């Protein structure tokens, strides 16, 4: 009847007259306010729209289970639903990401920030993107499918998502336009690899072809991070090639560059699949090989920064062994191969033989095929004790090689024709060598 | 006869720290 509409119209205006109270905190009440909203829709087929109510209750339902939700909309359509729903979604997702630790940095803010902080902001972002892909985008598809009873649902998922995508793409651009700094390589790759996931996840959750526009942006963003990775790695190779220091490493110790460069290349290999896809043995293989060539070529010229040819060798040994150890003790050895490693061992083998000849030939001349060789020996011991051979095994074998030549040769020379050092004195003084400290004897 | 373990060919920049050298901009 028209009286069944009057009663329906009544309680709506009663509820309209108090927007303070929400309809969805009263058991028998919320049951009644639906039946009224149904008769409005029935009558048309006063405005008595009460949508302003249902639109605000839905807002106050999604913000503080999802059963009141999927009933608010069946009565709402029979547009303003979509625009409202999508809004609150866009808002709540904005807050999730803020909590996660997603800033919207400017270009100036990015360029001025100290690496230690930018590092932690990128770290936060990768975590955020992982969450968005593996949790949120799926959750927002589940909600639209359950809540909305139209397929509109395609529009709602995308409009619920765009804001969330755009906000991560912002910081993607921030790092994309940042000055190229080797520091950042590993992080940019973490970001690239994280962001790559979005497309698969979005392709699985989007039925229609409106998800192509968002996928286009994400691609263009990925491709720029793709550019940022090629440029960063280039800057590393560029700065390595430019390095020309003529300060000799004291005690012939391992050069810090050798430590840094090899640490860097060892870390790249953790990103083989990405780096192989972006660069154009593996493309990374070719690059790793080139970069290590530059390091060797640089270190060879640093070995010529000595008056003593012996220290040139000790330096080349120590640094070339460290390189080979880091290659063999990682997936580097696998990539550039055995033949590469065998050759370096060859070079290290020859460098040691070069030392033993160069340093111990005049000392073995002071005994023939009065003769004071004490100055020769004292001078070697004097400063070769302050030298360093870091590797215990190599240090041991150089000493054993030295002694086995010099000691028996001295037992003969003295034992025949004889007056300062006994052969035991020399054995003990030989054991003090390469300890990076002046030996106790004098 | 440089006084730092790292020295740039292009700009003057030198340092005994590799990280500082490898992330230096050529001035
Ligand atoms: Zn420079």
Numbering used by the authors:
A (entry chain A): 85 to 129, 157 to 175, 217 to 230, 257 to 329, 332 to 460, 483 to 571, 599 to 647, 660 to 683
B (entry chain B): 44 to 70
Report text from the authors:
Using this sample, we obtained protein crystals that diffracted X-rays to 2.7 Å resolution at the Diamond Light Source (Oxford, United Kingdom). In the crystal structure, AVR-Pii and OsExo70F2 form a 1:1 complex. OsExo70F2 adopts an elongated rod-like shape formed by the stacking of four domains (domains A to D), with 16 α-helices in total (annotated α1 to α16) arranged in four-helix bundles. Following placement of OsExo70F2, we identified an electron density consistent with the sequence of AVR-Pii and were able to build residues 44 to 70 of the effector (residues 20 to 43 were not observed in the electron density). A structural similarity search performed with PDBeFold revealed the AVR-Pii structure is most similar to LIM domain zinc fingers with a motif of C-X2-C-X12-H-X-C; however, it lacks a second zinc binding motif commonly found in this class of domains. We refer to the AVR-Pii fold as ZiF and note that this three-dimensional structure has not been previously reported to our knowledge for other plant pathogen effectors and is distinct from the MAX fold found for other M. oryzae effectors whose structures are known. AVR-Pii locates to an amphipathic surface formed at the junction of OsExo70F2 domains B and C, with residues from helices α8, α9, and α10 contributing to the effector binding interface. Analysis of the complex using QtPISA reveals both hydrophobic and hydrogen bond interactions in the complex, with a remarkable 20 of the 27 AVR-Pii residues (74%) observed for the effector in the crystal structure involved in contacts with OsExo70F2. The most striking feature of the OsExo70F2/AVR-Pii interface is a hydrophobic pocket formed by OsExo70F2 residues Phe416, Leu420, Met437, Tyr440, and Val441, which accommodates AVR-Pii Phe65 and, to a lesser extent, Tyr64.
